[PDB]
Write a structure and sequence with these properties.
This is part of a larger assembly, with chains A, B, C, D, E and F.
Chain A: H1 21-35, E1 38-42, H2 49-63, E2 80-83, H3 86-97, E3 107-110, E4 116-119, H4 127-137, H5 141-144, H6 147-151, E5 160-164, H7 169-179, H8 200-206, E6 213-216, E7 219-221, H9 223-231, H10 235-244
Antiparallel strand pairs in A: 1-5, 1-6, 2-5, 3-4, 6-7
Helix pairs in contact in A: 1-3, 2-7, 2-8, 7-9
Chain C: E1 3-9, H1 21-24, H2 31-38, E2 51-57, E3 63-67, H3 72-80, E4 102-105, H4 106-112, H5 127-138, E5 143-146
Parallel strand pairs in C: 4-5
Antiparallel strand pairs in C: 1-2, 2-3
Chain D: E1 6-13, H1 21-26, H2 34-37, E2 43-45, E3 55-60, E4 65-69, H3 75-95
The complex binds magnesium ion (MG) (2 copies) and zinc ion.
The site of zinc ion has 8 residues of chain F, from loops.
Chain C binds one RNA strand through residues 3-8, 22-23, 52, 71-73, 77, 91-99, 101, 113, 116, 121-122, 125-126, 129-130, 132-137, 139-143.
PDB class: translation
Keywords: tRNA, mRNA
Entry title: The structure of the large subunit of the mitoribosome from Neurospora crassa
Amino acid sequence: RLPDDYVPPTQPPSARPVDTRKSQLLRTYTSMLRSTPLMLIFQHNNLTAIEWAAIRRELSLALSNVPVPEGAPDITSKIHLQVVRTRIFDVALKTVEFFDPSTVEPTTATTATGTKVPATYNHDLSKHAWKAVKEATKNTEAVEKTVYGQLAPLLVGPVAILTLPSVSPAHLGAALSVLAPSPPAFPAPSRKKNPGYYDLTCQSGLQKLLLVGGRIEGKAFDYDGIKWVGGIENGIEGLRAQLVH
Amino acid sequence: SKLGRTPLSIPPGVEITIGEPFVKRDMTQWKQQPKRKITVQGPLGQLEMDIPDFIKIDHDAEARRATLSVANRDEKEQREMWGTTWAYLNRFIMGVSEGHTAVLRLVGIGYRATIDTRPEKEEYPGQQFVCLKLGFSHPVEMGVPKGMKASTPQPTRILLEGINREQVMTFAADIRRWRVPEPYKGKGIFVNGETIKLKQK
Amino acid sequence: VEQVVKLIVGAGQASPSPPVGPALGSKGIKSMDFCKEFNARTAHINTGTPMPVRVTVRPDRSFHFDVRTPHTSWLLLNAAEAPIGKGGKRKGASNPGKEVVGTVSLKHVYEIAKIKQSELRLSGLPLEGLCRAVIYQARSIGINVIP
Amino acid sequence: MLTRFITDVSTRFNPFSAKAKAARLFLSFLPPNARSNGMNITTQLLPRNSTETPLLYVKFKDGKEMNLDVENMGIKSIVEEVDRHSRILQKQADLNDG
Amino acid sequence: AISSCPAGTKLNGLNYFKNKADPVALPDEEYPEWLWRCLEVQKKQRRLAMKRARAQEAKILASGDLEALAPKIPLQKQSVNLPGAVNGGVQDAVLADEKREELRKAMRKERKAKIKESNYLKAM
Amino acid sequence: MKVHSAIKKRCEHCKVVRRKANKRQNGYLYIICPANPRHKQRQGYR
RNA sequence: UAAGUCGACAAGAAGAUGGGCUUGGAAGCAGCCAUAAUUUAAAGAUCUCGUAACAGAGCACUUGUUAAAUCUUAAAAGCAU
Ligand SMILES: [Mg+2]
Ligand SMILES: [Mg+2]
Ligand SMILES: [Zn+2]
């Protein structure tokens, strides 16, 4: 039978309960803050399901028009405009930045057979992460100089984020024209070619979404910088011009 | 109490005066607990209260704030009066600065109200009397307590005003006690948006 | 506040009647004007076909309506080739758990999930999950699905 | 917070400025139907270079025009100030009914 | 061949339009790959069962190694970090979102039951 | 009002209170409800 | 339980779909059968009111604001009412 000291391997000791939605989200937004290189932080103000579905219908239409003959995997199906728990999404930003899993001294845990086996508790829900985040947050002015300090003012109130698996301006420019159009740089779609965009439900929602900022390659950005990044015709192409010099 | 901790913002013109602990001798009690006299003065008028001495007030003048605290949070009596004394002060401050008002709506066929004088029954010179015709064989006349101002913008609406809320809402309830709203037709006197769910027929 | 009414009517058979009469003739809209416009926005459809309609009656009783594709149930039954029953309409299984009125291959499901995606409010829903939703309805109307 | 007695609003803030927390929050309480009912709303985003004095202009249906300071005051202080005026407008409209 | 309906079949009553013919099925090769996997979602005798299965399940235990008999914690109750690494490549990002979504479906399935159970306790 | 020895809430709007307690009597336990006046109950007799 | 407990407040609480049957009518909510899915920050082929039937108001559930630094909830036991 199983002993008492034994803890499952897929359920190590964490700072707080695990089955709660508060922790399953923190475990989610951490991975989301690591994998996704490019994300834009929006602010949503009391939309309805019909308005949400309409906004998400234009993205799908606007993101499916970009040409993808590059042989790379299909990225359109992985871009999402997600609503987040701002209170937790702010914690996930500290954990990703201050916590350093390398500073954990492993400890031997007893398996079901009672044999002591080395096991290091590095997960983001660990007391070592909860402790390093707090102690590192005591200092206030020193935090404003970091990436988290430059983004905390945006994670106030309700917010949503648009994630992209890769930094593909061709994909971002198609998404910026639907959510935060700034003509003539990122012109909204035409009426003769996209009548769905200019519908009561869709148009009534885009007025509630207010782009507030972004985060690219672990660096905070503003609505002005996002335009430039999106303005890049192609990453490889931007490198070729540098070589022509 | 999460309310007592909340500081009290003293608006311009309002002045709070806190006295020193005093005891008035009572021949029927062997020991009277000390109390503090707090006077809230401003444009509309002045109000006074006597609070227990275990309630400490840190009046900040240059900041225009006043927070209350007790000497022992683990005592039931001190916890209770902590929030009660805070609520009364919040009313005193907002009553001497802006004033409290109560609106009475008269619903029914023949329900009217008028403000006049009754020099024969006046408790003090110039006392106003709210005369109500509420389907009774006799007329209903009530004198406004000293410190309140009653008016009637419309025949079926009364408006009370005063610096003391406990005195205003107590008078509004004294008028409503003549015709309490009924559920079958809605006839009665309603105070400050009071409503009543009707019946089937 | 703007009211909305659900009413299923024929393709071009719009007229003051049990379906249309008491459904909209009660709120005070120009019932005759409605049946005149609906019949013009439904001429390309086979006469008699059912068509769900959501008519939004604004304040001042100025209505604007949007016709919708026929119920998926009416399509699944027509695809399963179920036996006609009462009222001249194909009927589903009274006991879906046990009874089985028909069989629809997954090719039928593909077709029934594409005329439904034709709508503009459903044009964004991926066709993959949209074909697993009709399969979720067949289990309710007593219809088997063959690969 | 009550919004029935509001008709126009205008907001200008720098999102990266911690002082704008009240402005970004003020728009949190506006209902969904506000845009359709007739309330005119307008929000501007200032560049991150440096923050300008945020302006949260409010206007009721009675002609009142409030221009509050967003930096020194908190969202709680800004909500009750709008509760005061929106209450007398209802009591005045309550006793004026009929 | 895997399809019960060969090409050219007429789908009964799927053309509510006037100037058109009922849809006609196409070859199985053209049809998208996802379609053929859609039906993954379709989920005395006791004496004979408790006579052989009980004897069969016994040796299935084979309690020489207890680790294989672990409680099998669901995905909604674990604490292991999800597969997300900085600049780990587009493939890692794609394979990361699949697990984030894989966890969403688990919390969903558990929320449905909590809702059904709450309703049952309320109408008892 | 219904006088019972076992007073119970019958909805989410019912509240238990002890009223009529003063320096002379201990009072009674009451079930008061602003929604339905048929939920009004008293525990104890005068 | 500052990864904001508890309470209040603000908004949301979708779509296939009015599931099939039954019935004059049965559209989550007379009754019967089913109740794998789908998409979401979440949303029971439906827990309480409501309609002749629709509509409509709440709940489960979801996010936000306010806000506690010995201060949440439950059970058992002792003494009381
Ligand atoms: Mg039914
Ligand atoms: Mg019913
Ligand atoms: Zn009750």
